Design a protein around this motif. Sequence first.
Motif: not given
Lengths: 310, 310
Positions: A184, A187, A190-191, B310
């Motif tokens: 997480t 993620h 990468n956002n 996601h």
Amino acid sequence: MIDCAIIGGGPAGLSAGLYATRGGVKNAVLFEKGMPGGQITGSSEIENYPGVKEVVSGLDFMQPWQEQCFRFGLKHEMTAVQRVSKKDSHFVILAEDGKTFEAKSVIIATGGSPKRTGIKGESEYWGKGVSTCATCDGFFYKNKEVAVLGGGDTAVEEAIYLANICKKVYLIHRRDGFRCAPITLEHAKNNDKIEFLTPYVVEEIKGDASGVSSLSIKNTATNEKRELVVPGFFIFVGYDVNNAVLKQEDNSMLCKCDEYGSIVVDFSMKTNVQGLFAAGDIRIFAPKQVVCAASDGATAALSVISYLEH
Amino acid sequence: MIDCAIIGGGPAGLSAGLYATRGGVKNAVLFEKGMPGGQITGSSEIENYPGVKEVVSGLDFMQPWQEQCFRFGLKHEMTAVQRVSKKDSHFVILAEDGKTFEAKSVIIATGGSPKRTGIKGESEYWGKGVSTCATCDGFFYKNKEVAVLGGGDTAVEEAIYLANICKKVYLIHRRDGFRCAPITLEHAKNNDKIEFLTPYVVEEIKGDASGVSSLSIKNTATNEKRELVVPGFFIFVGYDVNNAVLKQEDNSMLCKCDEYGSIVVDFSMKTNVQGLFAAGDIRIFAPKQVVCAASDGATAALSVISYLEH
Ligand SMILES: Cc1cc2nc3c(=O)[nH]c(=O)nc-3n(C[C@H](O)[C@H](O)[C@H](O)COP(=O)(O)OP(=O)(O)OC[C@H]3O[C@@H](n4cnc5c(N)ncnc54)[C@H](O)[C@@H]3O)c2cc1C
Ligand SMILES: Cc1cc2nc3c(=O)[nH]c(=O)nc-3n(C[C@H](O)[C@H](O)[C@H](O)COP(=O)(O)OP(=O)(O)OC[C@H]3O[C@@H](n4cnc5c(N)ncnc54)[C@H](O)[C@@H]3O)c2cc1C
Ligand SMILES: NC(=O)c1ccc[n+]([C@@H]2O[C@H](COP(=O)([O-])OP(=O)(O)OC[C@H]3O[C@@H](n4cnc5c(N)ncnc54)[C@H](OP(=O)(O)O)[C@@H]3O)[C@@H](O)[C@H]2O)c1
Ligand SMILES: NC(=O)c1ccc[n+]([C@@H]2O[C@H](COP(=O)([O-])OP(=O)(O)OC[C@H]3O[C@@H](n4cnc5c(N)ncnc54)[C@H](OP(=O)(O)O)[C@@H]3O)[C@@H](O)[C@H]2O)c1
């Protein structure tokens, strides 16, 4: 003795009391530390309770629940429950004042509480832009910039979530390392709508007469100061489950809980102890919404009714 | 394509749309035949929805949900869904008007339908003394006399429940034998507040502006007729969940159901299919109350929001 002792007078407990009494439980008692209503009474606005079209304070929202949920014979005990224990095929409820009560069945509806920080401005701007609930207050910040405080799974998950509605999210944490899962965190890294600010602390939550305008933040390493201009500040620095009443004299738990101390229940709100049910934010996988807590209360009461018949 | 297709506009689907859209889902579409509101609109009085103190009809109760649940950009598709299928990483929604819609996620909120008898007066007094929900309407007949129709586990269990609230319960069934569990029959047969009327048929449900006032019944063994003066008549002759949309062209089902066709879900309202959720009376162990359905919808919408991330 009491047919059903409901521990906690927030939406879960109140709903359970309504349903239990309207379903024919003649001696149901709602135990509550203070004025019922629960956590929502600390909120300045609720607008997402299905079927209630008027936008009002949490306190005003809960006011009519008192007459309604007590309309069918529910009784009140204004007391702080210290412990619930099993004795033979009934329950013993010890209050902090020293009184003991006995009940055939018990619904645990004691909820929990988001942890606070004591950052300067937190109390003054609590509920105008200092929030501990992205689902409750996220929508107001559509196309705007927001900040999220914390480094756990909840902080990083809600940062990812707000990143889908807001223009930009500032994820503030006091260490370079995060407690959340690596997957997480990956993620979030990468956002592109999430700007990680680490290692940082929030020194003041600044606002107007109206409320939050900016955060005075500081890089703990360099002491560089920055004013983050955001009307929304979401705090996710942990959650306290109110499971103290489950702790027995020998430190064992009354019933099965998960690793976080939330009460394990099935779809009928039953615990692993006969006659013992749970409802609301205290139970595993609680979404933490008033309508969800109220539904749990109703479910638990329906199970109590069946139990007391059998 | 649609971010989330919500199938059914009762409290579950309406609450799902409110939460989904208030949670930032940009393209959420509610599919509904006729006007949202669901089963409760058949009731002349609801009073057990926590937080709504007024005693009003189901139709009046649901009216404020329309503006509220559509306040945040929910879209309405005014057509019945024939089928939901999964195709690659999305869903194909075949509507009865022949249109196909693609969606990234789906919430099944199609509810269910009590079986009706078609007895003279049933349609006219439905929700006005004729009930299929003892928890919903039993309290009105506290200390009064009521009649229950049917011979399965539901009818006999609800007769036993009502015998704890009402003065007397007449249990009417068209055969001397019952389909319920042996021990349930034994309890009912030996409950002094239940009077068995078998083998009987109800010929007419009679009443006035106030509601049901009597039943014309016939003993099929002896052909003799009687009038039962009761203000409340509870019908339990079966129930069907509305799971038709799950049926695939190849006769498989879209997702796992229980032995009766209710959709299996976890505490997050997740089915065994990725991107597919369910809420309300359609899912396993649904208590069949408005607040419970609304909670499921909220829960499913929060799961949808997470899924779409996601
Ligand atoms: C600031 C804030 C804003 C929120 N905004 C929204 C919103 O907009 N929409 C929404 O749906 N939800 C919102 N929530 C979440 C919602 O308030 C909770 O999910 C809900 O209140 C949970 O209800 P509950 O009955 O399970 O627990 P609680 O509300 O926590 O109620 C528990 C009750 O039990 C009492 N109690 C605890 N221990 C004892 C004891 N030992 N003896 C006696 N009494 C005891 C407590 O005093 C409390 O009154 C918000 C929460 C907060 C804190
Ligand atoms: C007589 C009676 C009295 C009741 N009284 C109470 C009460 O006092 N208090 C209470 O809490 N509950 C009461 N209930 C129960 C309550 O009505 C239900 O539990 C609740 O409405 C369930 O909500 P839901 O959204 O799951 O399902 P539903 O209300 O059944 O709504 C599902 C919707 O989906 C639509 N739909 C179905 N299939 C499709 C399709 N293929 N395409 C598009 N749309 C579709 C249906 O038309 C319906 O509008 C009562 C029920 C009855 C029958
Ligand atoms: N679906 C999931 O997998 C999921 C989702 C949510 C939660 N959870 C579980 O719940 C737990 C997560 O709890 P959660 O994040 O609420 O909180 P939790 O892990 O305690 O984490 C709290 C975070 O807030 C920080 N913090 C605490 N007090 C602070 C303060 N006063 N000022 C500034 N920062 C402060 C902590 O910093 P430090 O690290 O420096 O101490 C920590 O990063 C985990 O065990 C997780 O498994 C799981
Ligand atoms: N606690 C539990 O385990 C539990 C509780 C409830 C339900 N269930 C199960 O759920 C399923 C549904 O059962 P449920 O009782 O709703 O219904 P179900 O068993 O179909 O029983 C329906 C009853 O209605 C009668 N009936 C049907 N149409 C009628 C009509 N038009 N007029 C008069 N009577 C009519 C039937 O009569 P006949 O008998 O003559 O056909 C039967 O007695 C069953 O498998 C049941 O066992 C289990």
